[PDB]
Amino acid sequence: QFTNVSCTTSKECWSVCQRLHNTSRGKCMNKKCRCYS
Numbered sequence: 001q002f003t004n005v006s007c008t009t010s011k012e013c014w015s016v017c018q019r020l021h022n023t024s025r026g027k028c029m030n031k032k033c034r035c036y037s
Contacts, residue, residue: 007033 005016006028013026013033025036 001035003033003035005033 001021003013003016003020005012007013010027010033013028013035014024016033017023017026017035021035023035023037027034027036
């Protein structure tokens with residue numbers, strides 16, 4: 001799903017995603033960091 005968190009390095013979506021939802025896998029798009037199941 002989407003998160004209002006922007007990014008610079010994929011390292012960021014990861015921790016955000018796993019903390020917020022039961023995930024771990026994440027990757028960012030120029031618009032924002034994004035999470036995946």
